[PDB]
Amino acid sequence: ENFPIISLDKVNGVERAATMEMIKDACENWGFFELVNHGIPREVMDTVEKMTKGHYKKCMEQRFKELVASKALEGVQAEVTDMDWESTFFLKHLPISNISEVPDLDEEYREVMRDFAKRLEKLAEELLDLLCENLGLEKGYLKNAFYGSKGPNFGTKVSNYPPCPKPDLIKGLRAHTDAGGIILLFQDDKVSGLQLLKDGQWIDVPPMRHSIVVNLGDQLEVITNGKYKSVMHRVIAQKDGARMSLASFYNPGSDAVIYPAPALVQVYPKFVFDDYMKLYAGLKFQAKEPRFEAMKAM
Amino acid sequence: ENFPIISLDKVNGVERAATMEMIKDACENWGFFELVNHGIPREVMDTVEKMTKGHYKKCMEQRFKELVASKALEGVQAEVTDMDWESTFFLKHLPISNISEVPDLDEEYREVMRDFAKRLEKLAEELLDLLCENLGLEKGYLKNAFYGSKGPNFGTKVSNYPPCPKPDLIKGLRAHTDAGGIILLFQDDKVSGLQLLKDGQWIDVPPMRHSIVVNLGDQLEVITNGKYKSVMHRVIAQKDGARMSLASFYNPGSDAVIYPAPALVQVYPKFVFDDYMKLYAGLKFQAKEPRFEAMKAM
Amino acid sequence: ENFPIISLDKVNGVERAATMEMIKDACENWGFFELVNHGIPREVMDTVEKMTKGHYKKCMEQRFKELVASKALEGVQAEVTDMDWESTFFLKHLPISNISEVPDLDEEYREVMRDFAKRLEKLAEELLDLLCENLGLEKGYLKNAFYGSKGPNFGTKVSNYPPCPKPDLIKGLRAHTDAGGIILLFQDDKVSGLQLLKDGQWIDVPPMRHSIVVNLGDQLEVITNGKYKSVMHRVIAQKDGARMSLASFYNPGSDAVIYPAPALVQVYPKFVFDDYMKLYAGLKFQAKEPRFEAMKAM
Amino acid sequence: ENFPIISLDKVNGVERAATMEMIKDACENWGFFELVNHGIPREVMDTVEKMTKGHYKKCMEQRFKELVASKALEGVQAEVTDMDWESTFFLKHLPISNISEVPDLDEEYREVMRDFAKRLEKLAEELLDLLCENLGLEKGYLKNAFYGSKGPNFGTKVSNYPPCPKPDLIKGLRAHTDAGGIILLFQDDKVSGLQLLKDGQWIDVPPMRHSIVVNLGDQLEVITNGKYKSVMHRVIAQKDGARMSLASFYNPGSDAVIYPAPALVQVYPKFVFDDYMKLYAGLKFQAKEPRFEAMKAM
Ligand SMILES: [Fe+2]
Ligand SMILES: [Fe+2]
Ligand SMILES: [Fe+2]
């Protein structure tokens, strides 16, 4: 009944069996769990926060100079209330790290993001193995399924944003389930603003400090033949706090072939991960014959 | 073997049967035909041209003032070669004409577009009836199928554009078939730059003056159970000329139910026109369960 | 020492002289004053609020559908935290009201904005007359100076926005003085977030309900030969509240000739209002000879 | 009377004096000259062309995939005539080369741009010395004036563009003089489309192959106390050809102090180059007191 909050270090000790049973239960009945004692140092997370926030502040300062100047163009005084406070960019890590070639980051920043990205990779694969165990599969199974030819895709979206101006503005807002593998979310403050649908109703992720919030995608549901369902959610920015998010995605390689583990077995489909995303981006129906085939299906 | 060029007025005379046989043949074996003597006055088309071109010239003059000024911002001299010469906007006509409320047109312009849009509607419905006849269907059949509840959607895209900088830039460019009903294309100059794929190869639409180029969409293929195929094409702007296009679309109403005429009967599907477009815009797979169903299909 | 809060209705009564003396004092020593009892009904302001907020909510709902869909394009899940919550548009009123032809407002909205704009015009001209009186000028003087040929320019910027994500983000943010005539600001809630520089330090506009905040521009400083200085300010969106602003500007007509009243007399310049703005938009130096003349000046 | 076309290699020979006299005459009476035999190999220019064109073609292919996909979003078929064929980016070279960190260039491309940028720098400084000589100044004088503290700013704008859709669209288009030092323009084909105003009328730059077109900016006019005037021009893309431009700018360092050479001496002003550009970008009047000072000047 309570949202799973899990002290990962307990898997090294006498409490392991009960921690694995929480992980199992979250996987089966929540789709989500919040990790503490997960092995990424407080100091590293605090540095990632500070520096991301430093870069945000800079791009905001620059962005106001530019608003003032374009607005002057149209014979218009730009106010600070005209600001767009949302800023988001990505960083690839696997198979090829583009961290070196993304515009406008300090070197000291890129190296911090590098290290942090290696740490979370390592954490992800550990999590996948513990899922394997609970699941009766072999160590490495999911990392292997996710491998494809060149490897799993892994990146981190880095967001900075203001609070929602009022909750009823979210009233009518569609949620989703994530299409990929396993997602690890790192935020600032105490309140995420992250919510999951459970039995028709919205449950808040409980505020923690130095936590990582883990959730399973569509792909893990297929490989488990539905045993672990990817779950609907949303994330709304609270006046309370959490103005920054790092959402890192450990997804199957583009060419990877996804399908329910034979041991774990209606039957979920088999398919190449990239075709799941091409369905997703709307690039599987820009021809006529596909389209006619789909309307015959409905 | 020759692209169909059809003098529509001949349907009023002793030559009708041979003109209907061209229309039939184009419908079956070209998907396209070029109309002359189609009953829209030379004077009306020439006014539509002039005025569209007048409005283009204005939005270009304005657009250079703004480029000069934003470029100055970044300590940069804007050249005329920095110009974006492409300009396109739409006009609705049916079920509700938004021609009155589109920004930045002269009144004298809106009224010309109104009249012109009534004329082409009338021409479209005539064309659909002549298709009915060739097809063995009743007068009004297609207009009726297209009606839905509120009526057929009808609008005109108005484009102005420079020439392609070089043909091999189009080399690797995907074509398409139109998703809607029947399309009537009005251009300037002599060379369209419009091409259709016929038996694997690119055929140019032959240059004519005061012509209208007609082509059938995906919807007419379904209602004819494949007898009239919608055909692949593209349109590339020629150094030769044709720098302006008015493409008017007479499509089924959103809620209209499309399906192969029982008389005209594998079997094509039945479906609501709006679901064909939602497939098209990529809004039918932004949930997980649809997506899993589609991968099981492949 | 206290920010001027002025009950306008008191100019109809035994307290007039003391209210005029507040207006005089604010004009001379604050540049700003907050009006209550100003003669625009509570019901009208409350309707303007509600309806603006209704339109905001709609454009936000629509804006999230579009973010979800474009983000899907790039194989990316749009979150609600990716939202851009800032929305701003204008409405002209004088010399020609474009309220009828601005995209996407209910009719019931346009009529409310019309009425409201007539009311504030009337309030502005009253304020200018009371300035005349305090100043020793004739009734109508400033309205007349502002008239030019076709009339004074009058419009309203309508803004909706989230809170600033954190105050130190404003830390390093340039303020300004308004370039025009007289500005009347209508907000929601209680806290504006509006601040004025007075003797080197930031003073908050005091929270009021159904207030209008008035401030004088650069133009009124010139006509008063510096007696009424236009004052520096800024406006920052508070977590506390005030998520909406209507800032209406009563400025001199484009062709109006601005210059210190002979009675009110270094000497401020004389000039056409439009040249002050062209200086402002950076369109007075896009040629070489101007530029050389300015560097010789410095 | 004829546009100056100058074989630079002749400065190494018996013809030097007559070539220097052409350079002198162009500097005094044309502001522009076209260089051939200028010492940048045919092979290097041809490689720069090919590779720029290869990169253009790629960004165009990518840009059409994205248009098709966003247009589908709005239930709209993207045509090739909807294309925006204009593409432009910059490359810094001095004081710090950002060529390594600009997005989406082949390595083999960056190295070609590096070399090419060193070659043109070397050519620029040579040209400045020959100007010194004609002028009676010492070798290095202008390079030294341009040096400031960190060095001269040097970069190259790289443009690719379609033809102007029709000449009367340029009819009403403002020209300019360049604000910087000395500009070297490298194009493809034969016809630039570049024109200079000379005695009130438009003169075309004569078509040449493997030419470089040189022109003097506002800064060189000041240092020569008007002896060498920077001249008005424009560049329009011809159906004839020249679809690519590399415009490289050798300007004074930001902090450089520009002023008429004492030997060369109304008197032109003295000033820091960056203040000339800040005048230019419209950032010298975003405060009130500047503005009042300027209106008193007029
Ligand atoms: Fe998500
Ligand atoms: Fe088409
Ligand atoms: Fe202001």
Ligand SMILES: [Fe+2]
């Ligand atoms: Fe130029």
